[PDB]
Amino acid sequence: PVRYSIPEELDRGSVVGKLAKDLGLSVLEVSARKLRVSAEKLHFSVDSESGDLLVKDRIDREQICKGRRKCELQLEAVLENPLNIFHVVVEIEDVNDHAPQFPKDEINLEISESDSPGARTILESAKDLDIGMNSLSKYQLSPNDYFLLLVKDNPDGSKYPELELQKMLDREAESTHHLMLTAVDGGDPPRTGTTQLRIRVVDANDNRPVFSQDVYRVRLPEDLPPGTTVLRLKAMDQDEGINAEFTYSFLGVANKAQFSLDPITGDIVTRQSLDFEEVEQYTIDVEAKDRGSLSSQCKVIIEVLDENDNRPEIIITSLSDQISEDSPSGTVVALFKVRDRDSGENAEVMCSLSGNNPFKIHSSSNNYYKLVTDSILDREQTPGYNVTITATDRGKPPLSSSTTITLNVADV
Amino acid sequence: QPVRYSIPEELDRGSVVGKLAKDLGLSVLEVSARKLRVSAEKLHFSVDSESGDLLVKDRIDREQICKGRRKCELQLEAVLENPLNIFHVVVEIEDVNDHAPQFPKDEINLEISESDSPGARTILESAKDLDIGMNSLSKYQLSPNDYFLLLVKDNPDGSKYPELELQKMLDREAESTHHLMLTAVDGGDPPRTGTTQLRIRVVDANDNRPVFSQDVYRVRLPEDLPPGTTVLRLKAMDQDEGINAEFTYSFLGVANKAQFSLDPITGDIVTRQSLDFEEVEQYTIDVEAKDRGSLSSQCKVIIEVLDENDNRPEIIITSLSDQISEDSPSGTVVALFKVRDRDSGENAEVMCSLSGNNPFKIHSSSNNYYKLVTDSILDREQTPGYNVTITATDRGKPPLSSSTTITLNVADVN
Ligand SMILES: *[C@H]1O[C@H](CO)[C@@H](O)[C@H](O)[C@@H]1O
Ligand SMILES: *[C@H]1O[C@H](CO)[C@@H](O)[C@H](O)[C@@H]1O
Ligand SMILES: *[C@H]1O[C@H](CO)[C@@H](O)[C@H](O)[C@@H]1O
Ligand SMILES: *[C@H]1O[C@H](CO)[C@@H](O)[C@H](O)[C@@H]1O
Ligand SMILES: *[C@H]1O[C@H](CO)[C@@H](O)[C@H](O)[C@@H]1O
Ligand SMILES: *[C@H]1O[C@H](CO)[C@@H](O)[C@H](O)[C@@H]1O
Ligand SMILES: *[C@H]1O[C@H](CO)[C@@H](O)[C@H](O)[C@@H]1O
Ligand SMILES: *[C@H]1O[C@H](CO)[C@@H](O)[C@H](O)[C@@H]1O
Ligand SMILES: [Ca+2]
Ligand SMILES: [Ca+2]
Ligand SMILES: [Ca+2]
Ligand SMILES: [Ca+2]
Ligand SMILES: [Ca+2]
Ligand SMILES: [Ca+2]
Ligand SMILES: [Ca+2]
Ligand SMILES: [Ca+2]
Ligand SMILES: [Ca+2]
Ligand SMILES: [Ca+2]
Ligand SMILES: [Ca+2]
Ligand SMILES: [Ca+2]
Ligand SMILES: [Ca+2]
Ligand SMILES: [Ca+2]
Ligand SMILES: [Ca+2]
Ligand SMILES: [Ca+2]
Ligand SMILES: [Ca+2]
Ligand SMILES: [Ca+2]
């Protein structure tokens, strides 16, 4: 069978080939023998004037052949008296008229921030109706720091592009990315189909909640009433949504014996008054944990200020009841000292006696005070003295405590 | 000038603090005659008349009376009577390493998120050492492991607290729970160690995407399969646990599920409309699995349709001659026709036959054209016209046959 070649999509009236001239049929014979050229679901014509094969229907190679490697239409021609049938084979040359194009111009992708580097995400492949050289040739994308592109082929022979990311993403730095994806076919001239990809990063739980300060310090007096909001804590989570909701908790145990913490507000209050003489300062560890297991710890130390709330006590360590009547001036009759629970200026003491007695009080080293008689005494005036001595503090407000003691002298 | 003595704590009763009477020169006569009393605040001491020395009466605990204070000086005093007098004594208590460092709790339970960034720090409860000075806490050390490293830092009060610094990020899909040893050692002779075992439980994060068993699924199906058929069941797993392990299947491609439906709970993919091999021979579909997060994984499922002999062959008469010459020789062509079958393969090959009563015979030219010629001469006087029935039968199971009846007439030139 005679074979001819013709590029597709040719204009009507184009000359495929001179098959009648190839068979040596004269114009008289072409006219006399009714010459009809037939193909399956197609029309062709031969005009009596030129007696050649001319196209009658615009032919699309991609419509009738699709993915077939080569296209050969087996047309036939009919002659009559004498009657005969002839077979001709026609090859349709492909023309790069169908540019590669993506199913959708805009492609939206949602990728998790927590995705590991080196992951792969398959994308919709491009479509090129052209076959062979004019088919799709290569995929290339806009250059970016985050992403790299790979091209792999599925079993039917088409090429699909998938994305491999070199560096893990972070929406707290850049939330959304826009990129350009291009597909190019191998032909002259080359045509390109472009689709812009919009990638939005969804929040993960990779940022821990962080306090404003690493160490919190506040100074409080021991007379502060319970229920007082001693401190307010501050913390923030750079995440968003469920991954950004956190609560405060006392990491230490038994430190909140008199303390309370509101995790909703972050507040720290006291439920029982403090005593400087018991514990001078508290060190507590408080940690914030979000809905995930991300937790962060900060240390809160508080110092208690001493207040003059403890009165001084007088203690007579020793005293002499039987005193000789001939005692001279400067004779020691009693010994005592003072004790104060407070500290600082609230601990220093100033003490005094009644003054009706001749007795005078001297101060020795430490806080020990000797009670002596400054003048000689006669028993006829008074045989025994009871003395009331007052000891007053030096802090605000001064606390004074007094003691009465009895001493008797007999002259024999 | 007050006399000073030094004594280690926790001494037995009857121990000699110092020879205060000989240091003051009182002698046994004055110690016995003049009532000598040794007094301190909240403490007891005794002087035996025979030796006239300072003896302890109460076991003294330096941590009890001093706690965190830098130095310990008990201000003793001595009292004499007739004549009565007071003397000042200062006694320093030397610390003895008798209190071992001990942590507040023996068992430490910690919950750490797998997604925690490497290099993070987590403060732990500090140990307590009642001893002051040298005998106080000195260093923290833990059992060596690849994931964790230990740091020791001091808070404002002067104590040492340990915090954990992570070198390599954890992964509970590899090892769920870790057990470690925390040790605190004080600087004394002999050194004492307080040890607490800490239990770390790694909590699941959303770092593992769900993955299918295979990347490419392929199945072959016949076109006669009824709709509603469960075409395939998909299998996939998420190495995470809990909410982060619940995922659904979805059609990544668009319009590919025109006749397909997918139940993501079971993972099933069914067909809702019958297929036609002559329309689309093979389907390529992209299916993706997505968890509660945006972690997604893609697999490609391609299916092939099997051709079934459901399309019978059609006979097409391209040309025919109504007036046939009576002088027609043997082998002259009276008709031309061809056969067309939509199917492919053996289901496309055809075998056709005619009645055979007529002299006509069919010989095959190129393609599927069978040129209808007459093998023998016929005369019109015997029979002027023939009815011819030609039957075309398929070659696939079950054979499909279609026939056409053409009329041929003979004309006499005379
Ligand atoms: C795609 O790329 C081709 C070159 O391969 C260009 O000619 C076209 O304009 C588009 O940019
Ligand atoms: C992407 O870019 C191409 C040019 O290369 C355009 O023709 C197309 O419409 C899309 O904007
Ligand atoms: C001792 O002195 C104080 C004032 O310093 C008084 O408030 C107290 O009642 C006592 O007389
Ligand atoms: C000094 O004053 C106190 C009261 O402040 C008395 O209790 C004491 O007996 C002395 O007279
Ligand atoms: C802690 O460490 C000290 C010195 O390393 C040991 O003496 C003690 O028994 C404990 O192991
Ligand atoms: C923890 O471990 C130490 C030794 O490191 C022991 O001495 C201690 O009694 C506890 O078992
Ligand atoms: C034509 O012939 C086939 C068998 O060759 C039959 O099955 C069909 O029904 C028709 O009669
Ligand atoms: C040709 O043969 C077919 C199949 O046998 C018949 O159905 C038809 O009527 C004609 O006789
Ligand atoms: Ca075209
Ligand atoms: Ca084309
Ligand atoms: Ca193309
Ligand atoms: Ca981040
Ligand atoms: Ca985040
Ligand atoms: Ca968080
Ligand atoms: Ca107080
Ligand atoms: Ca106080
Ligand atoms: Ca006071
Ligand atoms: Ca001790
Ligand atoms: Ca000790
Ligand atoms: Ca110790
Ligand atoms: Ca993991
Ligand atoms: Ca995980
Ligand atoms: Ca997951
Ligand atoms: Ca069918
Ligand atoms: Ca079929
Ligand atoms: Ca068939």
mmCIF file of C-alpha atoms in Angstrom, chain A residues 290-412:
data_model
loop_
_atom_site.group_PDB
_atom_site.id
_atom_site.type_symbol
_atom_site.label_atom_id
_atom_site.label_comp_id
_atom_site.label_asym_id
_atom_site.label_seq_id
_atom_site.Cartn_x
_atom_site.Cartn_y
_atom_site.Cartn_z
ATOM 1 C CA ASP A 290 0.714 24.401 77.764
ATOM 2 C CA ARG A 291 -1.868 21.950 76.454
ATOM 3 C CA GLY A 292 1.065 19.899 75.208
ATOM 4 C CA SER A 293 3.859 18.709 77.455
ATOM 5 C CA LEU A 294 6.034 21.772 76.795
ATOM 6 C CA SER A 295 6.898 23.300 80.175
ATOM 7 C CA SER A 296 9.182 26.092 81.341
ATOM 8 C CA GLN A 297 10.399 26.758 84.871
ATOM 9 C CA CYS A 298 11.140 30.005 86.687
ATOM 10 C CA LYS A 299 12.277 30.609 90.262
ATOM 11 C CA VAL A 300 10.502 33.077 92.556
ATOM 12 C CA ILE A 301 12.319 34.119 95.737
ATOM 13 C CA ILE A 302 10.754 36.378 98.364
ATOM 14 C CA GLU A 303 12.295 38.031 101.421
ATOM 15 C CA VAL A 304 10.461 38.800 104.670
ATOM 16 C CA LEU A 305 11.077 42.065 106.527
ATOM 17 C CA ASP A 306 11.368 41.959 110.312
ATOM 18 C CA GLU A 307 8.762 43.949 112.246
ATOM 19 C CA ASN A 308 8.888 44.733 115.978
ATOM 20 C CA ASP A 309 6.121 42.313 116.961
ATOM 21 C CA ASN A 310 8.047 40.457 119.708
ATOM 22 C CA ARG A 311 8.408 42.086 123.132
ATOM 23 C CA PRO A 312 11.613 41.742 125.194
ATOM 24 C CA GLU A 313 11.696 39.346 128.146
ATOM 25 C CA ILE A 314 13.635 39.920 131.380
ATOM 26 C CA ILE A 315 15.400 36.869 132.837
ATOM 27 C CA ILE A 316 16.995 36.979 136.298
ATOM 28 C CA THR A 317 19.780 34.414 135.965
ATOM 29 C CA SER A 318 20.847 34.807 139.597
ATOM 30 C CA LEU A 319 20.108 37.010 142.585
ATOM 31 C CA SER A 320 21.066 37.179 146.251
ATOM 32 C CA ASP A 321 18.156 37.175 148.685
ATOM 33 C CA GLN A 322 20.119 37.447 151.943
ATOM 34 C CA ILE A 323 22.024 40.744 151.733
ATOM 35 C CA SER A 324 24.327 41.944 154.495
ATOM 36 C CA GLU A 325 23.120 45.200 156.035
ATOM 37 C CA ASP A 326 26.639 46.690 156.143
ATOM 38 C CA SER A 327 26.917 46.505 152.338
ATOM 39 C CA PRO A 328 28.985 49.451 151.017
ATOM 40 C CA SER A 329 28.355 51.568 147.934
ATOM 41 C CA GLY A 330 28.689 49.641 144.686
ATOM 42 C CA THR A 331 27.705 46.245 146.092
ATOM 43 C CA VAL A 332 26.007 43.972 143.562
ATOM 44 C CA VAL A 333 22.632 42.655 144.716
ATOM 45 C CA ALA A 334 21.140 41.031 141.588
ATOM 46 C CA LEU A 335 21.951 39.828 138.073
ATOM 47 C CA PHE A 336 19.655 39.713 135.053
ATOM 48 C CA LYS A 337 19.637 39.949 131.274
ATOM 49 C CA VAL A 338 17.202 40.685 128.468
ATOM 50 C CA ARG A 339 16.175 38.585 125.470
ATOM 51 C CA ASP A 340 14.444 39.814 122.312
ATOM 52 C CA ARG A 341 13.256 37.602 119.458
ATOM 53 C CA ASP A 342 13.452 40.320 116.783
ATOM 54 C CA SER A 343 16.578 41.333 114.861
ATOM 55 C CA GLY A 344 18.338 44.561 113.959
ATOM 56 C CA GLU A 345 17.367 47.818 115.646
ATOM 57 C CA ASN A 346 14.217 45.997 116.785
ATOM 58 C CA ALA A 347 16.549 43.887 118.978
ATOM 59 C CA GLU A 348 18.476 46.620 120.823
ATOM 60 C CA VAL A 349 17.080 47.421 124.262
ATOM 61 C CA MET A 350 16.897 50.348 126.675
ATOM 62 C CA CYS A 351 15.982 49.552 130.282
ATOM 63 C CA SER A 352 15.340 51.553 133.448
ATOM 64 C CA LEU A 353 14.357 51.013 137.085
ATOM 65 C CA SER A 354 11.707 52.560 139.331
ATOM 66 C CA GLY A 355 14.116 55.066 140.893
ATOM 67 C CA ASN A 356 12.509 55.171 144.341
ATOM 68 C CA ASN A 357 15.182 52.749 145.550
ATOM 69 C CA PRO A 358 18.814 53.830 145.980
ATOM 70 C CA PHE A 359 19.703 51.001 143.576
ATOM 71 C CA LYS A 360 21.306 51.735 140.216
ATOM 72 C CA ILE A 361 21.704 49.455 137.197
ATOM 73 C CA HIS A 362 24.913 49.034 135.208
ATOM 74 C CA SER A 363 25.343 47.338 131.833
ATOM 75 C CA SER A 364 28.090 44.768 131.352
ATOM 76 C CA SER A 365 29.330 43.272 128.094
ATOM 77 C CA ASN A 366 26.786 41.369 125.997
ATOM 78 C CA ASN A 367 23.232 42.136 127.203
ATOM 79 C CA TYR A 368 23.921 41.243 130.853
ATOM 80 C CA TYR A 369 22.979 43.958 133.374
ATOM 81 C CA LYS A 370 24.211 44.109 137.000
ATOM 82 C CA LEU A 371 21.863 45.620 139.635
ATOM 83 C CA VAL A 372 23.970 47.311 142.337
ATOM 84 C CA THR A 373 23.421 49.648 145.283
ATOM 85 C CA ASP A 374 24.946 53.095 144.777
ATOM 86 C CA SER A 375 24.657 54.255 148.403
ATOM 87 C CA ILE A 376 24.813 52.710 151.855
ATOM 88 C CA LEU A 377 21.392 51.904 153.313
ATOM 89 C CA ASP A 378 19.890 51.692 156.796
ATOM 90 C CA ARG A 379 17.509 48.857 157.652
ATOM 91 C CA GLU A 380 15.385 51.081 159.913
ATOM 92 C CA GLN A 381 14.093 52.883 156.814
ATOM 93 C CA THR A 382 13.118 49.726 154.908
ATOM 94 C CA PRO A 383 14.170 46.112 155.602
ATOM 95 C CA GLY A 384 13.205 44.784 152.162
ATOM 96 C CA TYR A 385 12.655 46.267 148.694
ATOM 97 C CA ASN A 386 10.533 45.003 145.826
ATOM 98 C CA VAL A 387 11.666 46.669 142.593
ATOM 99 C CA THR A 388 9.789 47.023 139.307
ATOM 100 C CA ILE A 389 12.185 47.335 136.362
ATOM 101 C CA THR A 390 11.005 48.161 132.837
ATOM 102 C CA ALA A 391 12.774 47.048 129.651
ATOM 103 C CA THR A 392 11.717 48.877 126.488
ATOM 104 C CA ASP A 393 12.521 48.052 122.870
ATOM 105 C CA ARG A 394 14.095 50.438 120.349
ATOM 106 C CA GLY A 395 12.032 49.588 117.251
ATOM 107 C CA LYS A 396 8.717 51.089 116.160
ATOM 108 C CA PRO A 397 6.521 50.807 118.020
ATOM 109 C CA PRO A 398 8.507 50.289 121.238
ATOM 110 C CA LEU A 399 7.482 47.265 123.304
ATOM 111 C CA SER A 400 8.137 47.425 127.050
ATOM 112 C CA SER A 401 7.939 44.632 129.620
ATOM 113 C CA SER A 402 8.452 45.066 133.357
ATOM 114 C CA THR A 403 9.260 42.684 136.210
ATOM 115 C CA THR A 404 8.916 42.985 139.994
ATOM 116 C CA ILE A 405 11.357 41.228 142.337
ATOM 117 C CA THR A 406 11.690 41.040 146.127
ATOM 118 C CA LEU A 407 14.886 41.314 148.188
ATOM 119 C CA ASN A 408 15.196 41.270 151.986
ATOM 120 C CA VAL A 409 18.164 42.102 154.230
ATOM 121 C CA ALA A 410 18.639 41.082 157.872
ATOM 122 C CA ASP A 411 21.309 42.472 160.214
ATOM 123 C CA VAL A 412 22.682 39.937 162.697
#
